[PDB]
Amino acid sequence: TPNCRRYSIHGCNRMYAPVCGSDMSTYANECTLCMKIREGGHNIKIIKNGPCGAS
Amino acid sequence: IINGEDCSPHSQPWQAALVMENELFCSGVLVHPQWVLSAAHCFQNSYTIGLGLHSLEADQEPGSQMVEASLSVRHPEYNRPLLANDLMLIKLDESVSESDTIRSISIASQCPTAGNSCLVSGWGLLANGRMPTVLQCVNVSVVSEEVCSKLYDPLYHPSMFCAGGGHDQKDSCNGDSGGPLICNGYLQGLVSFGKAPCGQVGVPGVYTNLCKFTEWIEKTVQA
């Protein structure tokens, strides 16, 4: 799902536009998810826009 | 805001909450009774802006106002190069009546001084990743352009400056975009961007360097 090539690896803007990752974490924005992908070395999909639900 | 605390209630009366779908996405700063300054990445076709807030619930908060804005203009060089020139001016549909809890702040014409302690405020994410109930305040120190440039190469541009990066992990964070960085009582910066996570030891946040935009801001408001 996320197209990380549209962001810089060196910074992410600080707007709150949340996305819910397939890892069960809500990311503050898609750019931040993309940083996690790069930091952790594993792809993470976007389950939906907005925060993750509970269970 | 990371490792800050509750601002004293209404101590930052220029603070503007940019909200849609009852969810805060950015802040802005009231700079004239009819103009709100924010980051260009917070751009929307129209705005609902909360003034005089402490909690984000307007019906608690006596003196607060939710106001409308249809017109905004992003700096013409925003995002060229990437992340640069991150400012925009929102023109409110009506001039707000200023009060003790809603009023404007002057924009600095001097450029930031390395070593100055500055205040930043907002409703963005806390250290623990939760949202605060009320507006948060923290102090961060300006770092030199050589630090800013090394740490953000090749993205560093004179329209930006760096603050924070201390061992104390004080920073702004996501949701703080567009809000104020105040040095000696003047609006010096706007929260713009940083790295993930926020409040990394040694890594300052990046702020829109408003001293480079005095002419453009004045020409826009005065026309």
Numbering used by the authors:
A (entry chain C): 12 to 66
B (entry chain A): 31 to 253
Give verbatim lines from the article:
Further, generation of a crystal structure provided insights into the mechanism underlying the high affinity specific binding of those inhibitors for their target molecules, suggesting that the engineered SPINK2 inhibitors preferentially bind to the groove of target proteases via the engineered flexible loop, supported by its constrained structure.
In addition, the KLK4/8 dual inhibitor, K41043 had IC50 values of 2.1 and 14 nM for KLK4 and KLK8, respectively. The randomized region of K41043 directed to the catalytic pocket of KLK4, and K41043 residue Asn23 formed a hydrogen bond with the catalytic His71 of KLK4. The S1 pocket of KLK4 was deeply buried by K41043 residue Arg24, forming a salt bridge and hydrogen bonds. In addition, K41043 formed a 310-helix at the randomized region of the crystal structure, whereas this was not observed in the wild-type SPINK2. In contrast, there were conformational differences between wild-type SPINK2 and K41043, which were primarily observed the in randomized region; the maximum distance between them was 11.4 Å (Cαs). The binding loop of K41043 was entirely buried in this large area, providing a high level of conformational complementarity, and there were no water molecules within 7 Å of the catalytic His71 of KLK4. In the KLK4–K41043 co-crystal structure, there were no water molecules within 7 Å from the catalytic His71 of KLK4. This may be because binding of K41043 to KLK4 excluded the water molecules essential for protease turnover, hence K41043 acted as an inhibitor, but not as a substrate. It revealed that 25 residues of KLK4 within 4 Å from K41043 were located not only in the S1 pocket, including the catalytic residues (His71 and Ser207), but also in a surface distant from the S1 pocket. In the KLK4–K41043 structure, the entire interaction surface area was 863.3 Å2, and included salt bridges, hydrogen bonds, and hydrophobic contacts.
